[PDB]
Protein: Cystic fibrosis transmembrane conductance regulator
Amino acid sequence: TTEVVMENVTAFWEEGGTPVLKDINFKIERGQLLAVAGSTGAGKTSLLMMIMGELEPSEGKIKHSGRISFCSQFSWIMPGTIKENIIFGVSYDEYRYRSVIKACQLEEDISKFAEKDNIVLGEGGITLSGGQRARISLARAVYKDADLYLLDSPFGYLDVLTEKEIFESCVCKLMANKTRILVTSKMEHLKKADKILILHEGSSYFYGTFSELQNLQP
Ligand SMILES: Nc1nc2c(ncn2[C@@H]2O[C@H](COP(=O)(O)OP(=O)(O)OP(=O)(O)O)[C@@H](O)[C@H]2O)c(=O)[nH]1
Ligand SMILES: [Mg+2]
Structure:
């Protein structure tokens, strides 16, 4: 039925501090995509942290079940091959790995190296670009089997067309049956999402659909 719910959620990082989230409400059905938008400091990553149990509500209720795969907004690499970085301790399957690689446009990068998927990262040899590290980090999160994918601004350092292509091939097509929360501000992502939550300084600036928002326009 419903995969993730927040109801009247208020939370604080620090006792007696200012609330980081204020009366937040949303629901995601199984297989849907929630886009979470808002300016820096609005509370988007903190919302993800609450779903992951790192931040408890002071008011309100939260529902979520099952395993989570989390993609940080800060890309990271550990010493090892590009294949090891993407599978990252999960069991290996050639078809699944290849599908993720292709959806993240990493096939083109990998094909250029003599060592192919065995190119070694994070050990002083290859220095990856920001966009390469972001696509590897996204691929790692998408390769993991999970009930809920939390993708925190995963398109760092990508030009707008590459971002659009990967949003479509990875988030929309490859992950079509999966419950997804994507922190993103881009118009097409909000338009393709089943629901949109725009945060501003902890509060719900807007919650609904892109179509509902368009209907409010003069
Ligand atoms: N005390 C404390 N404050 C935090 C922590 N993490 C985030 N914050 C603060 O909580 C507010 C929201 O922060 P975030 O949730 O990281 O904001 P965001 O929407 O993810 O911002 P961007 O990632 O820059 O787009 C901010 O005012 C932060 O200063 C923490 O671990 N401890
Ligand atoms: Mg953040």
Residues 13-14, 20, 38, 40-46, 73 surround guanosine-5'-triphosphate (ligand 1) (CB under 6 Å). The CA atoms of residues 103 and 165 lie 9 Å apart. The longest strand covers residues 2-11. The chain has one domain: 1-218.
